[PDB]
RNA sequence: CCGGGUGGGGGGGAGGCGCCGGUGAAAUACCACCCUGGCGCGGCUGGGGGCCUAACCCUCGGAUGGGGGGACAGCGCUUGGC
RNA sequence: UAAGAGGAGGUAUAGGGAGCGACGCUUGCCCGGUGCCGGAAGGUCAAGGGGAGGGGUGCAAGCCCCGAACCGAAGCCCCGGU
């Protein structure tokens, strides 16, 4: 795997399908779509000190790795 | 033709002038004494009135508002400046 | 700009044809809506309903702002105050009720129109029969007092000086667009150049 | 159905209607007649819709 | 500049910065209003209402059992035995339909009117054109029309007053002298609070009991809060 | 909207108006909570414009040295239109 | 499939796409429609920012759902070009 994280692991996927909106007022909404898709996380690149690595995902910067550079 | 049966009370409200204007254009006359023709007539009816009043047989007068029938139909503009000074004219 | 009225589902059939079409109307404060056009739209009939001249027996109107009124066909009964307040430099003063005829009482039937937090004006013709001095004595002071309106008239002399946006109904159309140049934006008849590039 | 209408008359005291036809042009004056509802009195209804 | 007034040493003492109480500023106004002849205190309040809406236009009174003196000039509208009760009780101006006809003629000397219900149809029809919305008019549940007119005047010498909020909500209560005791007229202003909140209508939004101030009518005085 | 009010600095060497008098629909001072009012104070802004550099982008015969770019762009979820 | 590779270790007298096909004489008239480019200023329209007012229960403070005055792009309409 090379879209996992170092403190977590996330490669998910979905399907998608679109129709109408008018539902409490009118007939019902149409449904003519079904297409499989994919829904990626965020890439990051970082450097702190003697310059290693890490690729965390956009909300575990302020939560995750500042403890491990607080040792 | 739809609405030829209505009372006076519940009428156009402002169309009275249009109905009264046609009443005097029937009947055999020589001099007309009109006070504000074009009271509630908006623009399209006041365009209808301004095309006849320079094409008339006898003489007419009109004692009305300024600026749209004056210097287009008017020929002598009498004016009462002070108390009782009706001699004062405008426009020839 | 809080609301006043939320009139909905208004329709009238006096002469067979529809006076008013199905709507859901709305007026709030800080507004100066003018009205225009037509010869038999009953814009004054319509005006009657907002004040409370009639009932419709179908509508579920609500109102909490109190209004004024100016009629279109009539005079008015006696309001004679001792040691007179703001009519000595305003239009006509105390006069007998036998001479009042013409552009003498239009300033008197609006002389009751300036009182008591009146929060809006429902006019139907302000400037009947009154000439140039009564114009500048109206428009100089009609713009004074704040609040929502709905003044309706027949020529854009003072209607360009005071109005921010203008309505026009053509069998109940509640189109709304910005005032002064309403006889200049009605060249959407020119986008009916189709029929001459489509046939 | 150009000039004819589907009108639906209600009471001078109460609820729902009694479903008839009208012309809208040669009469105009908001018709009214007399009928027997399900409260048994033979009252007069009015053109309400 | 700095114009200079006799009220300069007065408002070195009443510095308008803190929210003064009844009792602290009451003893302060005891020593403060110590110019020429005795102060006549009338605590006003300006209520945060829409007074042109008559569902929230409120007035009333409460009966305050204390000794008092020169304040509200009250027309008693009454007939014979109620008139004798009022004249024993200490009425400023007594009367009935005759004095109704007198104020209809030309004579004004009163601030409040109380009326006995035997002639109240005449006081409600006849007195409207001159009394009006001035602070003077009859009201049925505002301590104005009622059979206890003797109790109204008998207490006036100790307590009674009567509300009316004028244009923006301005309402009065006689609650003091140039140094009157505090407890007493403190009881006066506490039951003023109780009666105001008793005839408090539903239309409260925000600070209903909005603003509180002893302006009196015309002369020397500075304001008061009735909370403490 | 004539007069004048509103606000400061004066030329210094018992003083003026306010009381009284006056006048009439009110009468002279002056403290007035909170409301209408137009200028200011601590500031305040959806949006628009400047340069700076400890995010990152691209390149420098040994490259946290140096010199650029600059919070653009690139990238992730998401609305509308070809 | 994100990295990467051909363009090219080339830099507008170079590189992609479309059409007529040496040489000689020449390639006229239309911008109404369609496509492409340049648009001052304005007309409609999406999520999002907002909270006027109204609805359900509860001893009450409160907790739940609609909501719309105004502000918010590309594309279209309108005005000129080829
Ligand atoms: N009560 C009524 N009875 C009969 N017809 C009516 C009534 N009210 C309105 N109408 C009709 O509806 C139309 C509009 O009425 P009206 O109120 O006069 O329009 P308006 O907007 O006032 N225009 P104007 O007449 O020029 O002031 C008229 O042409 C009438 O024929
Ligand atoms: N019954 C009457 N008694 C006395 N004077 C009268 C009477 N009727 C009319 N007048 C006079 O006529 C005048 C009224 O105006 P009028 O003579 O109608 O001119 P007008 O231009 O029609 N008025 P307007 O159009 O309202 O500006 C007054 O100045 C009176 O002196």
State the gist of this model:
The structure is cut from a larger assembly and holds one copy of chain A (71 residues), two copies of chain B, one copy of chain D (49 residues) and one copy of chain E (228 residues). Chain A is largely without helices or strands and 71 residues long. Helix content of chain A is 11%, strand content 11%.
Q: Which key terms come to mind for this protein?
A:
part of a larger assembly; 5 chains; A: 71 residues; little secondary structure; two-stranded antiparallel sheet; 1 helix; 11% helix; elongated; E: 228 residues; alpha/beta; Ribulose 1,5 Bisphosphate Carboxylase/Oxygenase; Rossmann fold; three-stranded parallel β-sheet; 8 strands; globular; binds phosphoaminophosphonic acid-adenylate ester; RNA-binding; structural constituent of ribosome (chain A); Ribosomal_bL28/bL31-like_sf (chain A); rRNA-binding (chain A)
Layout of strands and helices, then pairs:
The structure is cut from a larger assembly and holds one copy of chain A (71 residues), two copies of chain B, one copy of chain D (49 residues) and one copy of chain E (228 residues).
Chain A lengths: L12 E4 L18 E4 L22 H8 L3
Antiparallel strand pairs in A: 1-2
Chain B lengths: L15 H10 L5 E5 L8 H6 L9 E5 L13 E2 L10 E2 L2
Parallel strand pairs in B: 1-2
Antiparallel strand pairs in B: 3-4
Chain D lengths: L4 E3 L12 E3 L9 E4 L7 E4 L3
Antiparallel strand pairs in D: 1-2, 3-4
Chain E binds two RNA strands through strand 2 and strand 8.
GO molecular function (chain D): rRNA binding; structural constituent of ribosome; tRNA binding
Organism (chain D): Thermus thermophilus (strain ATCC 27634 / DSM 579 / HB8)
Keywords (chain D): Ribonucleoprotein, Ribosomal protein, RNA-binding, rRNA-binding, tRNA-binding
